[PDB]
Amino acid sequence: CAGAATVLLVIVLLAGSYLAVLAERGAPGAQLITYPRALWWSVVTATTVGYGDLYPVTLWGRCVAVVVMVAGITSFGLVTAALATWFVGQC
Amino acid sequence: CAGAATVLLVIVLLAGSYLAVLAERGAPGAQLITYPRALWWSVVTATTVGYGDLYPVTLWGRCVAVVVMVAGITSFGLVTAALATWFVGQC
């Protein structure tokens, strides 16, 4: 259930990060072109935080970005409700 | 319950802020290197707001950032549902 949700998320993050650097390399001045930093990007997105060090300049990138948002926000939300119950049912 | 949640959050914020400046000092051009500003960082993150004045440049930093996100979003969410009921059960 919750371990499924984390995994799903840790999938989406590893999915997006992968596709983004792929999606992005070739576009001169792309920042979002190494999996490491493409990961930070992918976390910061699914958390709905939006720092702005990093983002897609390419279309295909942003198409990634959207899935990453859609899939990753929800799947993170799960881990956010997950630990919200765990503190609820306890104290 | 709610006072537990606030505390948890005010812990996470004081946790993250601490670790971040720790995590970050040494990295030339780190911004996120004084607890005061490392705090603002840590709030702005747990609120899922993402202004972008501040963020971790270091790996270890971002590792902090993640916990801060995970722990701090949820634990803030609590204080957000907390006062959402308090206005609900009242008016």
Epitope: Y18, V21, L22, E24, R25, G26, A27, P28, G29, A30, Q31, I33, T34, Y35, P36, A38 | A27, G29, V57
Partner: antibody, heavy 117, light 107 residues
Framework: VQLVESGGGLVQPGGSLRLSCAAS????????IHWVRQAPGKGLEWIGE????????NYADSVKGRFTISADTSKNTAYLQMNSLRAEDTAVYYC???????????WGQGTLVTVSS | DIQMTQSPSSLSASVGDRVTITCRAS??????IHWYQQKPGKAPKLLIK??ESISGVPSRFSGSRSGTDFTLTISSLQPEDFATYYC?????????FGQGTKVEIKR
């Protein structure tokens, strides 16, 4: 883990020639093989990259869409199709593994492609 | 594109002397520059990464500083250090290398 290049010697101006980077050691799903170059007594020239996984293969404006980069995961190789060759293409051509980290961990011996009439 | 300007081209520094090689990036490139020893006829060999050290690289080789000025230093120049030294962007697409710096051992 090391990279083994094949092909390349002499062509005529406007000729064609095909370079090879056989893989040969622990090789992950998602590595880019890259192509770098050095003219007689010059610097290094990033030229291309290719994920053999989805087979998408970015090039230098400097080397245009004159050269193509081929993948073939079945031979754990990658290749540097080399059309429309110029006196300048005269150089040595190292391939290189880059794990998505953006430095070159290993380097194929590098061959000499010469171009004169 | 991004312009690593290595400095200088030529060094005639004496063995066991302190040797330092500068790479001014055109913009702030994060910490995303790597060093590469390449010896006459051989392939580049990666010395430093993230401006961090690689398995098997000699201790004399360290790489520092930030902003636009990145520095690879050879504390105590060796006889086996006669080479050309290279500099690599990663921050923006595409990657770039520095003009390169040739070291010549004096004796």
């Amino acid at each position: 883990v090391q990279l083994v290049e094949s092909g390349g010697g002499l062509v005529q101006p406007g000729g064609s020639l095909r370079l090879s980077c056989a893989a040969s050691g622990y090789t992950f799903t998602s590595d880019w093989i890259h192509w770098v170059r050095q003219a007689p007594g010059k610097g290094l020239e990033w030229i291309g990259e290719i994920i053999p996984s989805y087979g998408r293969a970015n090039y230098a404006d400097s080397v245009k869409g004159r050269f193509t980069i081929s993948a073939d995961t079945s031979k754990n190789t990658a290749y540097l199709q080399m059309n429309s060759l110029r006196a300048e293409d005269t150089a040595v051509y190292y391939c290189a593994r880059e794990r998505g980290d953006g430095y070159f961990d290993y380097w194929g011996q590098g061959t000499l492609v010469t171009v004169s009439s | 594109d991004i312009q690593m300007t290595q400095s200088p081209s030529s060094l005639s520094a004496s063995v066991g002397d302190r040797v330092t090689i500068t790479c001014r990036a055109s913009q702030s490139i994060g910490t995303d520059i790597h060093w590469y020893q390449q010896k006459p006829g051989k392939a580049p060999k990666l010395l430093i990464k993230y401006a961090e050290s690689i398995s098997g690289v000699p201790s004399r080789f360290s790489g520092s500083r930030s902003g636009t000025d990145f520095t690879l230093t050879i504390s105590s120049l060796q006889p086996e250090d006669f080479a050309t030294y290279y500099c690599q962007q990663s921050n923006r697409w595409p990657f770039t290398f520095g003009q390169g710096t040739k070291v010549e051992i004096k004796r």
